[PDB]
Enzyme design. Structure first.
Site, PDB file in Angstrom:
ATOM      1  N   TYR A  27       0.790  -1.230   0.000  1.00 60.33           N
ATOM      2  CA  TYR A  27       0.000   0.000   0.000  1.00 60.33           C
ATOM      3  C   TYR A  27       0.816   1.271   0.000  1.00 60.33           C
ATOM      4  O   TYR A  27       0.275   2.344  -0.259  1.00 60.33           O
ATOM      5  CB  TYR A  27      -0.970   0.041   1.181  1.00 60.33           C
ATOM      6  CG  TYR A  27      -2.079  -0.955   0.980  1.00 60.33           C
ATOM      7  CD1 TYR A  27      -1.959  -2.256   1.415  1.00 60.33           C
ATOM      8  CD2 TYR A  27      -3.171  -0.633   0.200  1.00 60.33           C
ATOM      9  CE1 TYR A  27      -2.948  -3.191   1.148  1.00 60.33           C
ATOM     10  CE2 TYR A  27      -4.150  -1.565  -0.110  1.00 60.33           C
ATOM     11  CZ  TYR A  27      -4.043  -2.841   0.375  1.00 60.33           C
ATOM     12  OH  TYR A  27      -5.038  -3.746   0.059  1.00 60.33           O
ATOM     13  N   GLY A  29       3.168   4.184  -1.249  1.00 63.75           N
ATOM     14  CA  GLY A  29       3.776   4.750  -2.432  1.00 63.75           C
ATOM     15  C   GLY A  29       3.085   4.269  -3.688  1.00 63.75           C
ATOM     16  O   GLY A  29       3.151   4.934  -4.718  1.00 63.75           O
ATOM     17  N   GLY A  31      -0.441   1.299  -4.669  1.00 66.39           N
ATOM     18  CA  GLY A  31      -1.205   0.074  -4.532  1.00 66.39           C
ATOM     19  C   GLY A  31      -2.578   0.053  -3.870  1.00 66.39           C
ATOM     20  O   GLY A  31      -2.812   0.752  -2.883  1.00 66.39           O
ATOM     21  N   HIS A  47      -3.716   5.425   5.219  1.00 69.47           N
ATOM     22  CA  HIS A  47      -3.471   6.701   4.547  1.00 69.47           C
ATOM     23  C   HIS A  47      -4.165   6.745   3.180  1.00 69.47           C
ATOM     24  O   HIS A  47      -4.739   7.756   2.796  1.00 69.47           O
ATOM     25  CB  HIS A  47      -1.963   6.888   4.440  1.00 69.47           C
ATOM     26  CG  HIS A  47      -1.570   8.204   3.859  1.00 69.47           C
ATOM     27  ND1 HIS A  47      -0.978   8.304   2.618  1.00 69.47           N
ATOM     28  CD2 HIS A  47      -1.635   9.458   4.361  1.00 69.47           C
ATOM     29  CE1 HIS A  47      -0.713   9.579   2.383  1.00 69.47           C
ATOM     30  NE2 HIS A  47      -1.085  10.303   3.429  1.00 69.47           N
ATOM     31  N   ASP A  48      -4.091   5.630   2.461  1.00 72.33           N
ATOM     32  CA  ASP A  48      -4.776   5.526   1.176  1.00 72.33           C
ATOM     33  C   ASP A  48      -6.281   5.673   1.372  1.00 72.33           C
ATOM     34  O   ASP A  48      -6.946   6.382   0.610  1.00 72.33           O
ATOM     35  CB  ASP A  48      -4.465   4.191   0.509  1.00 72.33           C
ATOM     36  CG  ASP A  48      -3.008   4.024   0.080  1.00 72.33           C
ATOM     37  OD1 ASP A  48      -2.235   4.990   0.051  1.00 72.33           O
ATOM     38  OD2 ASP A  48      -2.634   2.845  -0.201  1.00 72.33           O
ATOM     39  N   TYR A  51      -7.019   9.418   2.060  1.00 71.00           N
ATOM     40  CA  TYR A  51      -7.113  10.167   0.815  1.00 71.00           C
ATOM     41  C   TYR A  51      -8.377   9.801   0.039  1.00 71.00           C
ATOM     42  O   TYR A  51      -9.000  10.650  -0.602  1.00 71.00           O
ATOM     43  CB  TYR A  51      -5.914   9.902  -0.078  1.00 71.00           C
ATOM     44  CG  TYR A  51      -4.645  10.637   0.278  1.00 71.00           C
ATOM     45  CD1 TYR A  51      -4.508  11.454   1.403  1.00 71.00           C
ATOM     46  CD2 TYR A  51      -3.561  10.505  -0.564  1.00 71.00           C
ATOM     47  CE1 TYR A  51      -3.312  12.127   1.647  1.00 71.00           C
ATOM     48  CE2 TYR A  51      -2.379  11.156  -0.321  1.00 71.00           C
ATOM     49  CZ  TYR A  51      -2.257  11.978   0.780  1.00 71.00           C
ATOM     50  OH  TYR A  51      -1.060  12.614   0.966  1.00 71.00           O
ATOM     51  N   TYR A  64      -0.352  22.247   2.005  1.00 69.03           N
ATOM     52  CA  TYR A  64      -0.842  22.684   3.290  1.00 69.03           C
ATOM     53  C   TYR A  64       0.342  23.208   4.111  1.00 69.03           C
ATOM     54  O   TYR A  64       1.499  22.977   3.796  1.00 69.03           O
ATOM     55  CB  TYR A  64      -1.567  21.540   4.018  1.00 69.03           C
ATOM     56  CG  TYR A  64      -0.731  20.287   4.148  1.00 69.03           C
ATOM     57  CD1 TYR A  64       0.310  20.215   5.072  1.00 69.03           C
ATOM     58  CD2 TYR A  64      -0.956  19.184   3.338  1.00 69.03           C
ATOM     59  CE1 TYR A  64       1.096  19.057   5.156  1.00 69.03           C
ATOM     60  CE2 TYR A  64      -0.180  18.048   3.425  1.00 69.03           C
ATOM     61  CZ  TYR A  64       0.857  17.984   4.329  1.00 69.03           C
ATOM     62  OH  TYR A  64       1.660  16.869   4.425  1.00 69.03           O
ATOM     63  N   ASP A  89      -1.956  13.072   6.348  1.00 70.12           N
ATOM     64  CA  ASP A  89      -0.496  12.926   6.277  1.00 70.12           C
ATOM     65  C   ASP A  89       0.113  12.868   7.668  1.00 70.12           C
ATOM     66  O   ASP A  89       1.006  12.053   7.927  1.00 70.12           O
ATOM     67  CB  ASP A  89       0.101  14.094   5.489  1.00 70.12           C
ATOM     68  CG  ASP A  89      -0.134  13.985   3.982  1.00 70.12           C
ATOM     69  OD1 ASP A  89      -0.808  13.030   3.540  1.00 70.12           O
ATOM     70  OD2 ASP A  89       0.401  14.854   3.260  1.00 70.12           O
TER      71      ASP A  89
END
Lengths: 121, 4
Positions: A27, A29, A31, A47-48, A51, A64, A89
């Site tokens: 996952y 960077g 995937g 994190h994915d 987003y 930001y 993030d």
């Protein structure tokens, strides 16, 4: 933005986001499939998802601002998207820090075919 | 940089 996320990652962890986290597991960077390999990869999975919560934001490019208050990341007020991207993030960078104790280099450049199956956010 |  991705560059800001990378700076946050380096600040937290001491590792360069490229190469340490840009190709890690299923996952990071890259995937969208697989059972995450370890806790660090689960940071990326979440994190994915985070987003993915923001379909009308542009997390890779929108910038930001944040500051530190006795080490802690504090996301400063920008647009709604910027605030939400920053919170995603921040969480991931803290998660990477919380899971350094189990980071494993064998998951860098992890091959795609070892990542299969969807896992719902 | 990553992707995500």
């Amino acid at each position: 933005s991705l560059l800001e996320f990378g700076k946050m990652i380096l600040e937290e962890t001491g590792k360069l986001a490229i190469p340490s986290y840009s190709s890690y597991g299923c996952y990071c960077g890259w995937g969208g499939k697989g059972t995450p390999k370890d806790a660090t990869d689960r940071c990326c999975f979440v994190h994915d998802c985070c987003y993915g919560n923001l379909p009308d934001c542009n997390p890779k490019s929108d910038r930001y601002k944040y500051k530190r208050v006795n080490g802690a990341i504090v996301c400063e007020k920008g647009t709604s998207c910027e605030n939400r991207i920053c919170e995603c993030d921040k969480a991931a960078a803290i998660c990477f820090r919380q899971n350094l104790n189990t980071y494993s280099k064998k998951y860098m450049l992890y091959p795609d075919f070892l990542c299969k199956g969807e896992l719902k956010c | 940089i990553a992707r995500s």
